[PDB]
Write an enzyme that holds these catalytic residues in place. Structure first.
Site, PDB file in Angstrom:
ATOM      1  CG  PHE A 117      -4.664   3.505   2.822  1.00 52.79           C
ATOM      2  CD1 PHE A 117      -3.398   3.370   3.364  1.00 52.79           C
ATOM      3  CD2 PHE A 117      -5.661   4.077   3.593  1.00 52.79           C
ATOM      4  CE1 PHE A 117      -3.126   3.806   4.645  1.00 52.79           C
ATOM      5  CE2 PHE A 117      -5.396   4.519   4.875  1.00 52.79           C
ATOM      6  CZ  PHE A 117      -4.127   4.377   5.403  1.00 52.79           C
ATOM      7  CG  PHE A 153      -0.127   8.989   5.948  1.00 55.34           C
ATOM      8  CD1 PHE A 153      -0.161   7.789   6.640  1.00 55.34           C
ATOM      9  CD2 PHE A 153      -1.208   9.321   5.149  1.00 55.34           C
ATOM     10  CE1 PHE A 153      -1.242   6.928   6.515  1.00 55.34           C
ATOM     11  CE2 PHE A 153      -2.287   8.465   5.024  1.00 55.34           C
ATOM     12  CZ  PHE A 153      -2.304   7.271   5.707  1.00 55.34           C
ATOM     13  CG  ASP A 154       2.843   3.874   6.409  1.00 53.74           C
ATOM     14  OD1 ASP A 154       4.066   3.656   6.287  1.00 53.74           O
ATOM     15  OD2 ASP A 154       2.045   3.030   6.868  1.00 53.74           O
ATOM     16  CE1 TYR A 190      -4.488   5.304  13.494  1.00 55.13           C
ATOM     17  CE2 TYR A 190      -4.375   6.118  11.246  1.00 55.13           C
ATOM     18  CZ  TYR A 190      -4.063   5.162  12.189  1.00 55.13           C
ATOM     19  OH  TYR A 190      -3.315   4.062  11.832  1.00 55.13           O
ATOM     20  CE1 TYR A 223       0.732   1.544   4.296  1.00 57.51           C
ATOM     21  CE2 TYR A 223       1.060  -0.820   4.362  1.00 57.51           C
ATOM     22  CZ  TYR A 223       1.241   0.426   4.918  1.00 57.51           C
ATOM     23  OH  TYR A 223       1.935   0.555   6.099  1.00 57.51           O
ATOM     24  CB  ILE A 260      -7.630   2.354  10.599  1.00 57.25           C
ATOM     25  CG1 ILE A 260      -7.232   2.165   9.133  1.00 57.25           C
ATOM     26  CG2 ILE A 260      -6.510   3.027  11.371  1.00 57.25           C
ATOM     27  CD1 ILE A 260      -7.034   3.476   8.383  1.00 57.25           C
TER      28      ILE A 260
END
Length: 120
Positions: free
Chosen positions: A112, A38-39, A95, A28, A58
């Protein structure tokens, strides 16, 4: 009722679907709605393996990968093994107001781009 939005980029085998308690292996890239990343598992050089449907990712991921814990939902396509998809997840399924200080701000929608490599 609140649900993530799922864009199917390319269908997988259309027969292997994760259920709660299953392990999935997934590549991902996670970004904000403005394209800021962010990731990512891909820059890490290794796909991400997790247990789905039990709150170890999540909620938006849980709902997406298990098709709402098997219950389905309006405009919520199933993701089979091998599928490439784009998950867009509202803050309440991510979040929330709290976010993650210094990484994800408050009330942030997460995007994502994913490829589901493995199911169990």
């Amino acid at each position: 009722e609140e649900l993530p939005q799922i864009e199917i980029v390319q269908e997988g085998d259309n027969t292997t679907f994760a259920k709660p308690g299953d392990t999935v292996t997934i590549h991902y890239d996670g970004k904000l709605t403005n394209g800021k990343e962010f990731d990512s598992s891909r820059k890490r050089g290794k796909p991400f393996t997790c247990t789905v449907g039990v709150g170890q990712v999540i909620k938006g991921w849980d709902i997406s990968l298990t098709n709402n814990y098997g219950k389905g939902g309006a405009n919520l396509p199933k993701i089979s093994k091998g599928t490439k998809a784009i998950l867009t997840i509202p803050p309440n399924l991510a979040y929330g107001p709290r976010g993650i200080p210094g990484i994800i701000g408050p009330n942030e929608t997460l995007v994502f781009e994913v490829e589901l490599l493995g199911v169990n």
